[PDB]
Design brief:
about 0% strand; Sf6; 2 chains; part of a larger assembly; Gene 5 protein (chain B); flat; phage; little secondary structure; virus
């Protein structure tokens, strides 16, 4: 949230002190989360290795 | 190298002649001269461009 360049705002207001938050889910549970993403969310690659003398 | 004897008549019977004593100078091998380097395969892959130079 940026007063001088509002073209970049991703969210609807300032986060001030005292704003209530919470945590998604139960306390100690173990689970397997599912994943949605767009193709350009994360990249992957591998570096070519030279041969030892 | 030789010395000589100085005599009125030049008879040397009562005296001692030049011996022949060899000597020699010895060359030896010295220690090695060694410059050694080592580097990780990782370093060569991402850091080592122009290793020749």
């Amino acid at each position: 949230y940026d007063t001088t360049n509002p073209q970049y705002n991703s969210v609807s207001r300032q986060v001030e002190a005292g704003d209530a938050v919470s945590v998604v889910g139960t306390a100690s549970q173990t689970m397997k989360p599912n994943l949605f993403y767009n193709k350009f969310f994360c990249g992957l690659g591998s570096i070519p290795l030279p041969k030892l003398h | 190298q030789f010395s000589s004897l100085r005599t009125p008549t030049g008879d040397i019977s009562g005296q001692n002649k030049n011996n022949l004593i060899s000597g020699k100078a010895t060359g030896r091998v010295g220690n090695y001269i060694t410059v050694a380097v080592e580097y990780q395969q990782l370093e060569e892959a991402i850091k080592l461009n122009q290793l020749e130079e």
